Amino acid sequence: KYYAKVTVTGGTGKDGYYEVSVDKTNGEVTLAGGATSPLTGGLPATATED
Numbered sequence: 001k002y003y004a005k006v007t008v009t010g011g012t013g014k015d016g017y018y019e020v021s022v023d024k025t026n027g028e029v030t031l032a033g034g035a036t037s038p039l040t041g042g043l044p045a046t047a048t049e050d
Helices: none
Strands: 001-006 019-022 028-031
Touching: none
Parallel strands: none
Antiparallel strands: 001 019, 019 028
8 A cells, every 4th residue: 555755864774665554534544564664665656647
């Protein structure tokens, strides 16, 4: 689900597209796997149209 770009100042290894699930009625994000650990894949883009 949604891929969030992360830019960390002063920290290494926390950069990456985090998987986020958003329900706007609550206004928060459900954690993927119950953690905020970075995912793999680097910075892949699927759809060219923006």
